[PDB]
Amino acid sequence: GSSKQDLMRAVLVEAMTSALNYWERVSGQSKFTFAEQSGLWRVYLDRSTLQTRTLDKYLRIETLPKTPRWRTVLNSLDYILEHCKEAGPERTHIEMQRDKLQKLLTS
Amino acid sequence: GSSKQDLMRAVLVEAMTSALNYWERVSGQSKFTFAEQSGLWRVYLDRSTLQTRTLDKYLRIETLPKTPRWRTVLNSLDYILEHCKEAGPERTHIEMQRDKLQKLLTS
């Protein structure tokens, strides 16, 4: 129902933002670099500056697309966890949010 | 010194035992299957029965070899975490023990 759909969207934003913050700290690379190196998100020239325009929409519930690319988000969480291994609460939180999303998508 | 060497051996046994218990529960497969499918540990015919004779020595501090194969143990932890994703305290403990071993080996 509407509650499950809104929960999925809230978890997707939490998971993506958490994963990017972890990527930035552990890899020492930018959000731009995650998109460019993984090939999972496109780079655009906006306001005369390179931007991960679509990825950026997934970092706030207000801008999340009407049709989220759930598999691309799960591939993003997997890519970040594949390249960033530092064990700890921050990583555990991303793993837990990944499992939550997967269970919501398959229930 | 002796303290660091004994700590490394104690952490190796904790990590291996933890990882195998997690593999068995999450994969629903045996220790034998972890060895056979990964190819990381040999199978032997002892007492007329198939056994992971060398791997078994890593599950008790009393039997741990004088010369542990540290890389084979780290490859074992990586293989189990690659195939078993269930997020939770049990998985976090294995990740934490893996990081502890790596830091001891590089300090």
Author numbering:
A (entry chain A), B (entry chain A): 1022 to 1128
What text comes from the article?
Chitin is sensed in V. cholerae by the hybrid histidine kinase ChiS. In a recent study, we showed that unlike most histidine kinases, ChiS is capable of directly binding to DNA to regulate the expression of the chb operon. Previous work from our group demonstrated that ChiS is a noncanonical hybrid histidine kinase that contains a DBD at its C terminus.
Here, we present the crystal structure of the ChiS DBD at a resolution of 1.28 Å. Since no structures for close sequence homologs were available in the Protein Data Bank (PDB) to serve as search models for molecular replacement, we used the single-wavelength anomalous dispersion (SAD) technique to determine initial phases. The structure includes 105 of 106 residues of the protein (1024 to 1128), two uncleavable residues of the purification tag, four sulfate ions (SO42−), one 2-(2-hydroxyethyloxy)ethanol molecule (PEG), two formic acid molecules (FMT), and 200 water molecules (HOH). Notably, however, the ChiS HTH has an insertion containing two anti-parallel β-strands connected by a turn between helix 2 and helix 3 that form a β-sheet. Structural insertion between these helices is not typical; thus, the sheet feature found here is a distinct variant of the HTH which we refer to as a helix-sheet-helix. Consistent with this idea, the β-sheet insertion has the highest B factor (a measure of structural motion) in the ChiS DBD structure, indicating that it is relatively flexible. Mapping these residues onto the ChiS DBD structure revealed that all five residues were found within the trihelical bundle that forms the helix-sheet-helix, which is consistent with this domain playing a critical role in DNA binding. Specifically, these residues were located in the β-sheet of the helix-sheet-helix (R1068), helix 3 (R1074, K1078), and helix 1 (R1090, R1092).
